[PDB]
Design a protein around this ligand. Structure first.
Ligand SMILES: [Zn+2]
Ligand SMILES: [Zn+2]
Lengths: 722, 23, 25
């Protein structure tokens, strides 16, 4: 596949010694005239719910249509922040790391300055038209085909740019192909300013920064070629055609007057190029953002090997669209001069947020804080632990701590409808931080999360050495190797040996396990100092963490609410208490001395026993033993935990139970009820309704009322899961 | 009280414990 | 609010732990 250009009609020159700089093709003394003609003849642009339409009354065009204003949205302005809020805002097109772009060359191209890429869109659903922008040159029809982009720097490491608009997840490919010669920067700027500003009223698109822009763009007109590649039409002919044609064959063509331009459904540019130009701001924003993320990597300390993960962690749910520039200008230009195939008559994505990684990062931060505050204060009870913890996990604190990573400069916070205070911004930083540390916890090891949060906590580097390097537990401190030596003359460990054999867990320091079973009744002892009210705290923390990770990984299509629900039904009081009772932790409990005649324990107490055992397991071992434990005693029984759960609603129970099903790629739907039979007289009525979850029928009910019938159907669908 | 659950639990715990003994 | 004082006390205790930490050396 080889790329080729049309001949240079004395305009361009490929002379070796007539080149200026690292240029290949130079513009002769015949291009300046054409440029002046194009500039003087096609430069006439700069020469000349009720309250919303009322405020648009000044110089109306046609219909109600929707024209674009420099800085304002469909309803009022698109900005209501501050003066210094410009340089710290990302919607204002201010990316950290972007400086002044050195001007390339006046006319002559820049092969040694511009890196060429070809921009296509897959799949082409809104690409090919019956009336494409076709220009004829040397007795050959040259058809339009995407855009060519010239960057002032290599992309090196940038992921795929995906964006959804026409209810289709489009992919803007930017394949580095051979560079079509015979072009000039001044000409590309002429066409860009004639299209992206004049014809298409696309203001508020800062490709510079308030001098050359960030990316150059050249139209592509291909004629195709046998036994080879294809031929690209040179720029001079593009200018010549756009100049000569600006003077059912008129069907599907874009016309402009002095609104901006409209697409005649009933200049020689049709609804082909315009539609293909509305994908460019998205790609440019994407590239620039991923280019400024390299300055984020040095702030974090950890370099993400997956840009998509970092971006998704930085994405904010305030983004209703994935477009680059102002949504108003985009939709307006798409509806006024976009593509529109002939008519015969003439559900948002919540998984693209950072709420997932926030849901994970909550458990991550919780776990780090819990563990560190646990080991660094072996004398402090549960009260001070929970106090410190709650004092740290606080959202305001997490926001102020998130500012140390300059997350406010890398966040994708969009402008709201009208209300946009500091609260939304700082809160956004707070959540996005948890998303970040969640992602770091995911890709990088847990130790990376420890290092991140630890380094971010204390400003003094002397305090970090203590926080990061927490000492072993007092019951592990006394005995370097193990407590197996102490078993021989142990009173309680003899009992716990059975508990070790029944689970197959051979504890290293049995003092921990003995502590985990020491109820709040007893005080202090030789075998165990204090009760397990600390391991209840730490236990709750590690349980929440592991469960959160499991539900995050094995349910990648469930949003925040679904994961929250499933976790609430996976790790609650009655559940872990039931597990604790099933393992038989009642008999191995430690209370009083001999006052406890029967083995009657409260449900909550059993829950505390399970949590404390998991904490002791984590301390004596690691998170793997915990994960295994919950993988045998919690996770696979998730569905079961919903079946024998407390009743509330057959519909809700069936919904949550069906929420466990093998979700593919589409978000999990809710059980659909379809009425089958409506029989009976005016008095009585026997309704027969069947449940349809994602097509397949699960159970069928027959009741006197519609709600009772569908509840009967839901119950029938719940009995089938037994 | 289910002996089956603690049986499978003992199985996997023994499995992991013996897995860390092979490294 | 109170969390500020709590965090302050935390920093103090960390300074104590660090002082003891290097005191061990
Ligand atoms: Zn603003
Ligand atoms: Zn340039």
């Amino acid at each position: 596949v080889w790329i080729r250009c049309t001949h240079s009609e004395n305009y361009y020159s490929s002379d070796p010694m007539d080149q200026v700089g690292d240029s290949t093709v130079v513009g002769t003394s015949r291009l300046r005239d054409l440029y002046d003609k194009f500039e003087e003849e096609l430069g006439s642009r700069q020469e000349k719910x009720x309250x919303x339409x009322x405020x648009x009354x000044x110089x109306x065009x046609x219909x109600x249509l929707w024209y674009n204003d420099p800085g304002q949205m469909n309803d009022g302005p698109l900005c209501k922040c501050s003066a210094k809020a410009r340089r710290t805002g990302i919607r204002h097109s201010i990316y950290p790391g972007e400086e002044a772009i050195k001007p390339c060359r006046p006319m002559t191209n820049n092969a040694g300055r511009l890196f060429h890429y070809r921009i296509t869109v897959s799949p082409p659903t809104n690409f090919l038209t019956d009336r494409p922008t076709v220009i004829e040159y040397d007795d050959h029809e040259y058809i339009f085909e995407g855009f060519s982009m010239f960057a002032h720097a290599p992309l090196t490491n940038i992921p795929l740019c995906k964006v959804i608009r026409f209810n289709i997840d489009y992919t803007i490919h930017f394949i580095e192909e051979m560079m079509p010669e015979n072009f000039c920067v001044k000409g590309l700027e002429l066409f860009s300013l004639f299209l992206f500003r004049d014809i298409l009223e696309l203001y508020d698109w800062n490709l510079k920064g308030p001098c050359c822009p960030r990316f150059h763009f050249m139209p592509r007109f291909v004629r195709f070629l046998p036994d080879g590649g294809k031929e690209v039409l040179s720029m001079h002919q593009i200018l010549l055609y756009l100049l000569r044609c600006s003077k059912x064959x008129x069907x599907x063509x874009x016309x402009x007057x002095x609104x901006x331009x409209x697409x005649x459904x009933x200049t020689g540019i049709r609804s082909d190029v315009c539609q293909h130009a509305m994908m460019l701001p998205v790609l440019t924003h994407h590239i620039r953002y991923h280019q400024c993320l390299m300055h984020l990597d040095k702030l974090i300390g950890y370099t993400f090997q997956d840009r998509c993960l970092l971006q998704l962690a930085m994405t904010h749910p305030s983004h209703h669209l994935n477009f680059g520039m102002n949504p108003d200008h985009a939709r307006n230009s798409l509806s006024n001069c976009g593509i529109r195939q002939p008519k015969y008559g003439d559900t948002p994505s919540r998984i693209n947020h950072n709420e997932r990684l926030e849901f994970l990062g909550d458990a991550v931060v919780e776990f780090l804080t819990s563990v560190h505050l646990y080991y660094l204060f072996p004398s402090l009870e549960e009260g001070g632990l929970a106090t410190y913890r709650t004092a740290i996990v606080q959202n305001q604190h997490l926001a102020m701590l998130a500012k140390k990573l300059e997350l406010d400069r890398f966040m994708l916070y969009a402008h709201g409808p009208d209300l946009c205070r500091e609260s939304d911004l700082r809160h956004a930083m707070a959540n996005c931080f948890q998303a970040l540390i969640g992602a770091v916890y995911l890709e990088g090891s847990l130790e990376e999360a420890k290092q991140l949060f630890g380094r971010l906590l204390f400003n003094d580097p002397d305090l970090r050495e203590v926080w990061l390097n927490y000492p072993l537990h007092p019951l592990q401190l006394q005995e370097p190797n193990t407590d197996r030596q102490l078993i021989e003359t142990s009173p309680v460990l003899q009992k716990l040996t059975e508990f070790e054999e029944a689970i197959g867990v051979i504890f290293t320091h049995v003092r921990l396990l003995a502590r985990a079973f020491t109820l709040r009744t007893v005080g202090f002892n030789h075998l165990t100092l204090g009760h397990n009210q600390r391991m209840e705290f730490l236990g709750d923390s590690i349980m929440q963490l592991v469960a959160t990770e499991y539900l995050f990984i094995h349910f990648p299509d469930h949003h925040e609410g679904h994961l929250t629900l499933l976790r609430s039904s996976l790790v609650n009081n009655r559940t872990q208490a039931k597990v604790a009772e099933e393992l038989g932790m009642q008999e191995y409990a430690i209370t009083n001395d001999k006052t406890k005649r029967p083995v009657a324990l409260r449900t909550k107490t059993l829950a505390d026993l399970l949590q404390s055992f998991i904490a002791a397991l984590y301390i004596d071992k690691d998170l793997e033993y915990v994960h295994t434990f919950m993988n045998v005693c919690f996770f696979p029984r998730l569905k079961e935990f919903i079946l024998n759960q407390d009743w509330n609603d057959p519909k809700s129970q069936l919904q949550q139970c069906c929420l466990t099903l093998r979700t593919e790629g589409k978000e999990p739907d809710i059980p659909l009820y379809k009425t089958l039979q409506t029989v009976g007289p005016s008095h009585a009525r026997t309704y027969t309704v069947a449940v349809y979850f994602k097509g397949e029928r699960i159970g069928c009910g027959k009741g006197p009322s519609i709600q009772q019938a569908e509840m009967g159907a839901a119950m029938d669908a719940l009995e089938k899961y037994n | 009280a289910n002996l089956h659950i603690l049986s499978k639990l003992q199985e996997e715990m023994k499995r992991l414990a013996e897995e860390r003994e092979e490294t």
